[PDB]
Every structure is written in structure tokens, then in C-alpha cells.
Design a binder for these strands. Structure first.
Ligand SMILES: [Mg+2]
Ligand SMILES: [Mg+2]
Ligand SMILES: [Mg+2]
Ligand SMILES: [Mg+2]
Ligand SMILES: [Mg+2]
Ligand SMILES: [Mg+2]
Ligand SMILES: [Mg+2]
Ligand SMILES: [Mg+2]
Ligand SMILES: [Mg+2]
Ligand SMILES: [Mg+2]
Ligand SMILES: [Mg+2]
Ligand SMILES: [Mg+2]
Ligand SMILES: [Mg+2]
Ligand SMILES: [Mg+2]
Ligand SMILES: [Mg+2]
Ligand SMILES: [Mg+2]
Ligand SMILES: [Mg+2]
Ligand SMILES: [Mg+2]
Ligand SMILES: [Mg+2]
Ligand SMILES: [Mg+2]
Ligand SMILES: [Mg+2]
Ligand SMILES: [Mg+2]
Ligand SMILES: [Mg+2]
Ligand SMILES: [Mg+2]
Ligand SMILES: [Mg+2]
Ligand SMILES: [Mg+2]
Ligand SMILES: [Mg+2]
Ligand SMILES: [Mg+2]
Ligand SMILES: [Mg+2]
Ligand SMILES: [Mg+2]
Ligand SMILES: [Mg+2]
Lengths: 204, 111, 64, 53
RNA sequence: AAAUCCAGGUACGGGUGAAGACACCCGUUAGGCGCAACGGGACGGAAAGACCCCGUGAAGCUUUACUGUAGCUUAAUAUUG
RNA sequence: UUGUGGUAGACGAGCGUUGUAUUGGAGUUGAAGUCAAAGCGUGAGCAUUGGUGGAUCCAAUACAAGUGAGAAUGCCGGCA
RNA sequence: GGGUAGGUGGUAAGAACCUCAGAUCCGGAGAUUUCCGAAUGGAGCAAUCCGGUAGUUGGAAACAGCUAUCAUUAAUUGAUGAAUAAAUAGUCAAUUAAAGCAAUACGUGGUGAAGUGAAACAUCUCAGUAGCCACAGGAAAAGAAAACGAAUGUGAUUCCGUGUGUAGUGGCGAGCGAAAGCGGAACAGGCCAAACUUAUCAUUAGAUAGGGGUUGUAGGGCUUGCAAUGUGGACUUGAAAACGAUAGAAGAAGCUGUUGGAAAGCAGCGCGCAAAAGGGUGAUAGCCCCGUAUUUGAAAUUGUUUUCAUACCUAGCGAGAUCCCUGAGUAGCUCGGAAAACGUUAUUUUGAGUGAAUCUGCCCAGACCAUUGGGUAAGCCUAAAUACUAAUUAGUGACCGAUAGCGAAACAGUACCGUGAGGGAAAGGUGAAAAGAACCCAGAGAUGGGAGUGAAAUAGAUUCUGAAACCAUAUGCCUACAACG
């Protein structure tokens, strides 16, 4: 609104109040801010629950999930018959892109999800574009032919590597399974069940 | 490609002229018309105008010319076939010259 | 304008309430009082400032 | 009236403005009673019995 | 062209009537249609009467009507030893 | 058997227009529109024929309304 | 790049050309881009006038061509430099940004009425609305507890439903009306100052540039050890891949007869469909044409996502010392106002005045005190859910169909009105195809009557259908002694 001349006022005091609030010294912190936030965890003393909370983050991250979707899946499985500690494991492992990554035609789980969303993926009684449909234990997932028309081929090899609860034949692009993953195939990265009781408190 | 070109033999499949054979002299793509010689002969009442060196005479009586015809009413005429018939055409691409060529679907005749 | 040069705090507009709560708009003005200071080699330059900044100036040793 | 959304049946009956195919969770009163004729799958009827309660 | 115009084929006397009638009652008079005139009437035309009253209508103006306020003046306080 | 004058008003039963949903039907051998006539109804209203006209329209049951013009010194257009 | 055999924009015929060495046309990327206009060399009555400087070409010079540059403000830097020795003010030069506009729409802030209601009116309402102004952004604002609040309680902000028209607030009148809790959409918490320490400033630093730190079941610094080499971001550069956007390619199936001016209608016999959406074709076409379903394709530009690597950030649990740091004209208080539902009051804010303390600390739990409990003010940044559509693509409508729908279906903000701001219309349809009536007659001609084209000319340019009021003609009846809603 005039010749404010920030030099004139800033130097005018050299400490005061406004200069120090504003002090051009103000650095960038353009990486400190982001990274530390990122994601944290640890266990504490006063609430105990710290262990449970951290495990949820790991579990949710292992599959690339937003917390809201997880609450829906827990609500679904919660009501049924009884001690369902065998059901929700099948539900959490029934993701199509999870099966596609565990099927072995993608280098990483998120890449498989991207593929699924990009329309690589052919199902049985249906087809698939959304990478979140909950699949049934005994279902087939025939891979497209256009994907093989784009030979990056490197994938097929991973497929054979596999893990015992999935049966897939390389090159021929076909897959199914039975005897749903036991806890051995769900390694000690996240193997606990008191986060489960926690979700009954947070989710009715 | 185009169904009708300038030059190919054509007939009329609807209207007063049925089996009306002629040669297409010119094609208007925008108005979907086609001038075919010998068909749709109209005789404009020719006035007399004298305002130019050529208009000093401009001898015009009962000149009968050609009226344009909708391209839908036209149908390609077969010539290679022993029994000429009216049919539809394809747009096959032969790898011999990589050029698009029209071929009938009730026979195997090119163009 | 009627404003301080050190800070940017200016007038405060409000109501002039009287008996019977009759409303009339009024203006509170800041205490612009001349003041001389020593900055950049002690260069004195008269600056119209609010009494609050003057008290702030007095305690901060600048005013000497 | 179909419970498993067969694709071959949906590939057909789509250029026919007359006939149509629907799931149990998609039919309504008007779609059912406009039919004048309908072909029901055996497991759809059993699923109906479950739904009817 | 114009204002006007509910449809009209549009007399007078006495009476009647929303209380002063071309149209109602009782009588009298009068062939159909123009033209030039003058204004009696059609409570003639133009202007939802300016006068009067009503509206818990408007606006302008006045004052020791009410409530406030610009301005003027006095004191405390800060700049102010 | 007792009834049926009627303003303000209360109540009940219907007509008509356009469109939508289901059925059926007519139409260049002539639909809508539009004019005329010596028809049918208790009322809104509804037909028949002929002329003009040249492409949509009708019947039933429901549904939704910018749904019914005589007046506002009402608006617009035309003509006295 | 795609794509062909036509093209030279509409009222538009003709004349003259271009085009198969691939035209016109569509898409991507570029080139040129007069003057006014933020207008910015100076002015000025907008599309005009008058220049300076440095080059270069003609002239013998004035001069005239051809180029580039010349506004102001702010920041940085350098040079020069007054009153007055120094030093500044000032002056000059260079570099970097700012100007303005629009999306009749959303955001923030400042300012801010009145008509009206209360059946008058002043408190109040209207309403923090209209308007004025400033600043943006693609959203903005808000935001991580000195909090809610009464409990073995929740644990940033934002938005929706309920709580409810409840508690309350109101000349207790008209009226106004939450905050908790609960159910949902989305979810994210970070970073400085001070301690302590390093280096440098006539080191009077009280300043500059680094390491250390970011708190509440207090945190950090001081000294001393164990365990760590990771996980994750609101993150930089690259490489690769995938999904698209900006032109496109292919894309099935019918004949006969009848009315008819014309068949696609009607009837007979057929055919195709992942195509029976639609448009045109002389009537009403699944199979005439263009298309549609479906399968495909990008030289160039661009969007989203993923993978790999790569900068930049990011890390636990102990012991002792009892020492230091934790945001002051600040929080409070007084005098006038305001924000919250509250008409000023516990909480928030401020115009004037005054003014604290430092974890045995400070604030809060609707005056206030004590106990209990909760939380760490006076520093900063923060995606998502949220608000809107001038525009681009596709599409829809028990929406309108020339007095309707935008004022504007036509060349409408035009004609026109006003000095100006401003106000502001009406007007669409020949025929399938102009085949737009050659020729003859009357007339000066327009025009009319024939002829001709056409299914129709009473479809003729006055051009779909053509209602009434209104004006004329005529068959038949009545009417010139007659008082007439
Ligand atoms: Mg007021
Ligand atoms: Mg007149
Ligand atoms: Mg009397
Ligand atoms: Mg009388
Ligand atoms: Mg009078
Ligand atoms: Mg009056
Ligand atoms: Mg009054
Ligand atoms: Mg005084
Ligand atoms: Mg009655
Ligand atoms: Mg109807
Ligand atoms: Mg008729
Ligand atoms: Mg109406
Ligand atoms: Mg080319
Ligand atoms: Mg008022
Ligand atoms: Mg009032
Ligand atoms: Mg923001
Ligand atoms: Mg094609
Ligand atoms: Mg085809
Ligand atoms: Mg068709
Ligand atoms: Mg307090
Ligand atoms: Mg308030
Ligand atoms: Mg404490
Ligand atoms: Mg603190
Ligand atoms: Mg209009
Ligand atoms: Mg009109
Ligand atoms: Mg004629
Ligand atoms: Mg007409
Ligand atoms: Mg007589
Ligand atoms: Mg007589
Ligand atoms: Mg009489
Ligand atoms: Mg009589």
C-alpha cells in the first residue's frame, strides 16, 4: 500500500516480534515434513494397544488398503457362525490382485493391481476391471492373450516359483486353487489375532 | 474408400427409371448426389439474356441435361461376371499392392 | 493512512452503543505518536508508530 | 431369470427389444408382471424360496 | 386521421323506479334515407376527483415531541521530561 | 314414502386437454388440422357424411400436470 | 500422421485454374501474426500524431529507407554522490518479478444498508443479506487440543443424517437457535525458537552460516552405554511398462407382385445379428446408403498409474546427574465494542491503559474458591472427503416447439430510443427434384389469362395447413304509417 520496504522494517528492529516470526532464514524442510510423517509406529506403556495399532498398519499396508475398505470387510466377516478365525484369513487373501500377484505374473502386488485395473484380467462366470472383488476359494482366473502378445514374459517365470496354496501352469496362463493358505503361507510379518478383537470395539 | 466413384458403371434401383444404365460423370460427396448420363432428363425453360459477348447470342431452347441422384438409389454394375447382377462391395486390402480395392460379395469380381 | 509503519495494525470499526441500545458506527484509532529510533548506523528517522510499539520499542533497548 | 449371469445368454437376447434376461436382485414387480411369460432357472427358484422366508 | 365504442332497428307527455328514463306503465305523435346548420340531452368525451373523509399510507417542513448523532466545549489518561 | 328455489359456503359424483406405461387398432384405397350439414346425450361433451388438407392418429385401464378463459381502464396481433 | 478422387468458404450459377510426384479435407506440432487496447518512448479526442538512441544502406549533407531498443513500481547488485568531514538522502546502470482480463459460478478478508416483519415503532428482525473494495486458487477456508466433557469416556480439520425446533436466548414480543453424543464420507500429522555446541564478524554480537530439538502417561539439552543399518513419505532426477485423450480401418443380411406421381407401406416367400440406437433415401426400410454392436490402429503432443535405481528426510529400549531450555507488552486486569444459539458472559477477539509465573510452573471443566481431573497458549505448513460450471466429448428428458423455449431458431444485444449510464423488439416451413413457368394474348411495364414442367399451379416465389372478427357477390324470404335489450 506504499513503499513497505521489508528491508527498512525488518532491519529497523532486528529482533522485535514480527521479524523473528517471518525471519527470511526460514529454510525449506521440503523433505523433513513429508518423510517422517509417511508412517510410524511403536509400542507404549500407558495404553498397551500400541502393539495392536502398529500391526494393523503393517497388515493394511501388506495389501495396499485404505482403512475404510478394511472396516467393510471386517463387518462382512464378523457376523456368520462362530469363532471365524479361519474365515477372515480367506477373506483377506481373496483379493483378485493379491491372487494375481500370488499367481506370479507380476513383479509386485501393486503392479498386479495396476494390471488388473488396466483390464488384463479374465475370470470365469464373469470378467474383471476393478481390483477389489472378493473371490471364492475354487475359481479360475484365465489370463488374457493380449498380455502375452506384449511379451515381458519375465513374469511367467515368477509364476512357477509360486507358493504351495496356488496351482498355476506357466505359459499356458491359467490358475485356480484349493486348501486356502494356512498360517505358514502367511509369514510372521503379520501373524496375530488381537487386532481382530480391537476391530469389534471400533466397528460394531 | 467410396461406394461410388467417377467413371464406374452404375444403375438405378428405385424410381421411375429401373435398370437405368449410365456412366457417372461427377460425384458430390457433401450432398450425397451423383450425376448419371441419360437418366433424369429435365428441360429447364431457358430464358434469353444478353449482357455479355457470349450472352449476345446464348442460344438456349429446350436443353435437356442431367439431374443429380441420391447415392443410395445407385448400385454398382458387374461386368466381369458372365451373368451381370446387382450386389454389394467390400473394401479388401490386397498385400500385393497394399491398395484398397472394391470386391463384390455375391461373387469374386474386383471393382 | 492512519496506520502504524512498524506493524500493520490499523483502525478497529465497531458500534457506539448508548442508552436504549441505539446503534451508530464509530471508529477506534490507533495511537500514532511520532518516534525516532537508531537503525543502520543509528540513523534517526521519524516514524509515526502506535504507543504499543513505542512501549515495545522502549523495553527492547533500541530506543536506547 | 438368472442367478449366475451367463454371458452367452447375454450376448444373445440383446438385439431383441422383446426378450430380456435379469438377475434375481434386479427384477422388480413391473419387470416380473410385464413378462406375460418367463423362464426361471431351478436354482433361481430355490434362491427365491430362500429369499421369500 | 383522431379521441369514443356492451349489442342496437336509438320520439314526446304524465307517472314509476337506486329517489332527474331512447328502452318500464298509461297515452300522444311519427313514410324510408340523406345534406347544410346550432348546440339542449345522451347525469356527452378527455383525466381510477386536485376539494372532503378513510389508511395504525408516503414525502417536505417546524419545534422547549421522543431517541440519537456530526460539530463545539470541559475533565481524566497516553505520547510526557 | 318424504322430497329436488337459492348467494357466501360445506359435501359427493363426473366431463374435457397434453404426455407417459401396458395392451389392441386405423392411415397416400388418405391421419391430424379445418369448413358445412335438417344428428346423439341431464350437463360438461360425443359422433356421421362431404369439401379442403397432406402424415400421423385412435380405443381401454392407470399415472403426471405450465389442464379448462368473458371481464383484471389485462398483454400481443389483426380488423371495424 | 490419417485419408482419398475431387477441390477453389455461404447467399452462387458462370468464367479461369488446381488435383493420382497424391489435391481439397481431419488430427498433432510449428511459421507469419497491421493498429488500438494492462499499452509500457512522449502525447492523445482508441485504432491517430510527434520522437530519442545504437546500428546498417543510398545522399554531397539535411534527409530517407531497413533493424533492435527506449514506461512505472518493487527486490538485488554496482557506480556516483548534497546540505556537512565521514555517511546517507538523492542520481545512474544491470538483472529478476509485478501490472491487465474473464467463468452473469464457487473462496477468504475489509466495509456494509434499506424495503419489510413485529399488524404502529425506537430494542430486535431483515442481515452480516444486497452493494463497494482487496487477494487468489483450481478449489478456497480450516486444521493436529493450554480440546470436548463427566466417564474404568473420545482423541486434527472438513462434509452429510440425527440429536430438535431440544437446552437455551428474546420490548421473554416478533423471532433466533446450538454445543456434546451417535451413525456415515475421507483420514496424516509434521516443522522451527530456546537450551548445548562449531566457525566467522575493530567478536563490545545482542549478528551470520552449521550440528542438536519439537514435547504432556512432560519433552529436550548435560554425562555414560546397549541396540540399529532398516521402514516409510505430502519427496528430485532418470529409464521401462501399462491404461487413455487429440485423426481413423474393417464391420452381416431381399427379391417378387399391388395401390400409388413415387414403396420403404400392403401381401408372398426368405436372410443376418455381440449390429432391431439413429439419420437419409420421392410415404411407414433390421437386410438401399451412412452408420451402430464388435475387433482394431498413432509418426507427434499430452494425462493417469506402476516398476527399478537415484539424490533429499526418516529410527528403540536403559543409567546417572537434580543442573539448563520449553515461544512476554504475552496470558491476565480495567474502560468501550464485538464472536459465539445468546441482546455480552464462563470461552474467543481488540481500540485505550496497566501488566505476571516458569513443571511443586501455566490454562481449562458457564461467576468464584478448594479437591479431583483434562490440556500444554503467546511459532509455521498440511492432501482426502467439501463448493461451482463459462468451456471440451458422449448422452438423457411423461422439458419448449416460433405469443413457447435464452431477450436473441434469421446477420440479436442487431434495427431502434437516450448526451450518457441504460432500455430493447419483431421476423422459420414452395416442391421429391426449380423441373422457378420458354412461347402466345392484353398492357408502357409490373402483372394477368392461356401454354409448358410437375402427382398436385386454388403447390407460382404473396410460396405447409389457413380459424374468427372484417370487407364484398349471389339463389330464396321479408322490409318505405313505423315506437323496436
Ligand atoms: Mg437497525
Ligand atoms: Mg381507423
Ligand atoms: Mg318516486
Ligand atoms: Mg322518468
Ligand atoms: Mg364528463
Ligand atoms: Mg378514486
Ligand atoms: Mg402512520
Ligand atoms: Mg481534550
Ligand atoms: Mg339445489
Ligand atoms: Mg390422452
Ligand atoms: Mg377432414
Ligand atoms: Mg393456464
Ligand atoms: Mg500428407
Ligand atoms: Mg427498520
Ligand atoms: Mg412494521
Ligand atoms: Mg490451504
Ligand atoms: Mg469404415
Ligand atoms: Mg454394412
Ligand atoms: Mg430405416
Ligand atoms: Mg480466563
Ligand atoms: Mg450476534
Ligand atoms: Mg502439570
Ligand atoms: Mg508451551
Ligand atoms: Mg421468440
Ligand atoms: Mg408470431
Ligand atoms: Mg396461375
Ligand atoms: Mg397458405
Ligand atoms: Mg307497409
Ligand atoms: Mg296512422
Ligand atoms: Mg307505447
Ligand atoms: Mg311489438
Amino acid at each position: 500500500k506504499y513503499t513497505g520496504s521489508i528491508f527498512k522494517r525488518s532491519r529497523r528492529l532486528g529482533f522485535s516480534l514480527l521479524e523473528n516470526n517471518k525471519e527470511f532464514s526460514k529454510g525449506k524442510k521440503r523433505k523433513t515434513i513429508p518423510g517422517q510423517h509417511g508412517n510410524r509406529f511403536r509400542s507404549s506403556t500407558m495404553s498397551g494397544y500400541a502393539q495392536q495399532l502398529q500391526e494393523k498398519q503393517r497388515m493394511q499396508y501388506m495389501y495396499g488398503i485404505t482403512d475404510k475398505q478394511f472396516r467393510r470387510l471386517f463387518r462382512l466377516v464378523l457376523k456368520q457362525r462362530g469363532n471365524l478365525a479361519v474365515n477372515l484369513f480367506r477373506v483377506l487373501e481373496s483379493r483378485l490382485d493379491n491372487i494375481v500377484y500370488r499367481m506370479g505374473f507380476a513383479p509386485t502386488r501393486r503392479s498386479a493391481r495396476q494390471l488388473v485395473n488396466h483390464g488384463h484380467v479374465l475370470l470365469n462366470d464373469r470378467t474383471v476391471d476393478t481390483p477389489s472383488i472378493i473371490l471364492n476359494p475354487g475359481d479360475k482366473v484365465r489370463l488374457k492373450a493380449k498380455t502375452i502378445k506384449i511379451p515381458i514374459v519375465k513374469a511367467a517365470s515368477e509364476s512357477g516359483v509360486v507358493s504351495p496354496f496356488v496351482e498355476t501352469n506357466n505359459k499356458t496362463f491359467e490358475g485356480t486353487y484349493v486348501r486356502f493358505p494356512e498360517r505358514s503361507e502367511l509369514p510372521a510379518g503379520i501373524n496375530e489375532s488381537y487386532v481382530v478383537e480391537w476391530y469389534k470395539r471400533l466397528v460394531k | 474408400m467410396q461406394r461410388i466413384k467417377k467413371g464406374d458403371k452404375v444403375v438405378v434401383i428405385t424410381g421411375k427409371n429401373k435398370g437405368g444404365s449410365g456412366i457417372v460423370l461427377k460425384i458430390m460427396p457433401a450432398r450425397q448426389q451423383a450425376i448419371v448420363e441419360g437418366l433424369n432428363k429435365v428441360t429447364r425453360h431457358k430464358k434469353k439474356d444478353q449482357t455479355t459477348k457470349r450472352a449476345a447470342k446464348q442460344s438456349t431452347g429446350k436443353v435437356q441435361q442431367e439431374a443429380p441422384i441420391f447415392l443410395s438409389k445407385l448400385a454398382l454394375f458387374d461386368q466381369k461376371a458372365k451373368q451381370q447382377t446387382i450386389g454389394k462391395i467390400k473394401y479388401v486390402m490386397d498385400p500385393k499392392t497394399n491398395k484398397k480395392t472394391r470386391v463384390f460379395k455375391k461373387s469374386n469380381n474386383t471393382l | 493512512a492512519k496506520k502504524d509503519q512498524l506493524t500493520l495494525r490499523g483502525p478497529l470499526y465497531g458500534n457506539n452503543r448508548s442508552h436504549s441500545k441505539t446503534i451508530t458506527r464509530r471508529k477506534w484509532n490507533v495511537n500514532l505518536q511520532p518516534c525516532k529510533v537508531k537503525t543502520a548506523d543509528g540513523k534517526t528517522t521519524r516514524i509515526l508508530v502506535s504507543t504499543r510499539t513505542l512501549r515495545t520499542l522502549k523495553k527492547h533497548n533500541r530506543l536506547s | 431369470v438368472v442367478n449366475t449371469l451367463n454371458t452367452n445368454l447375454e450376448q444373445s437376447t440383446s438385439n431383441i427389444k422383446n426378450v430380456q434376461v435379469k438377475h434375481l436382485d434386479k427384477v422388480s414387480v413391473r419387470d416380473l408382471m410385464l413378462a406375460n411369460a418367463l423362464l426361471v432357472e431351478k436354482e433361481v427358484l430355490k434362491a427365491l424360496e430362500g429369499k421369500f422366508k
